[PDB]
From Swiss-Prot, chain B:
Homology family: Belongs to the turreted BTV-fold inner capsid family.
Residues of the full protein shown: 891 to 939 of 1275
Record-given protein name: Inner capsid protein lambda-1
Complexes and interactors: Homodecamer; each decamer is made up of two conformers of VP2, called VP2A and VP2B. 12 homodecamers assemble to form an icosahedral capsid. Interacts with protein mu-NS; in viral inclusions.
Function noted in UniProt: Inner capsid protein that self-assembles to form an icosahedral capsid with a T=2 symmetry, which consists of 120 copies of VP2, with channels at each of its five-fold vertices. This capsid constitutes the innermost concentric layer of the viral mature particle.
Localization of this protein: Virion
Biological source species: Reovirus type 1 (strain Lang) (T1L)
C-alpha cells in the first residue's frame, strides 16, 4: 500500500546541463537516492 | 545571440508558457456550423428554386 515517488523538480531544471556543476551536485544526490526510490520504473526515469 | 545562449534551455523555457493555444478547435467548430448553414441555405433555396 506504499509508494515512494520523487518530484521531477527534484531532478535538474530543464533536464539539467552537462556543463552545470550545481546540476552535477543534483545528479550525484539523485543517483544516491535513485536506488532508494521504491518506484519500479525509477531505474528507467534515472536513465532517461 | 545571447552570450550564454543554450538553444535547448531558452527554447524550452519560452515554449512552456507559449504552449497554451486552443483557438483553432473553437474556430473549426464555428466554420463547421457555417458549412451546415451553407448546405441548409442551398436546400431551402432548392425547395424554392
Amino acid at each position: 500500500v506504499v509508494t515512494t515517488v520523487i518530484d521531477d523538480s527534484s531532478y535538474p531544471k530543464d533536464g539539467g546541463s552537462v556543463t552545470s556543476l550545481e546540476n552535477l551536485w543534483d545528479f550525484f544526490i539523485l543517483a544516491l537516492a535513485l536506488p532508494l526510490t521504491t518506484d519500479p520504473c525509477a531505474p528507467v526515469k534515472a536513465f532517461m | 545571440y545571447p552570450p550564454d545562449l543554450v538553444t535547448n534551455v531558452w527554447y524550452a523555457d519560452a515554449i512552456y508558457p507559449m504552449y497554451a493555444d486552443t483557438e483553432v478547435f473553437s474556430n473549426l467548430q464555428r466554420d463547421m456550423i457555417t458549412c451546415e448553414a451553407v448546405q441548409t441555405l442551398v436546400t431551402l433555396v432548392a425547395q424554392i428554386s
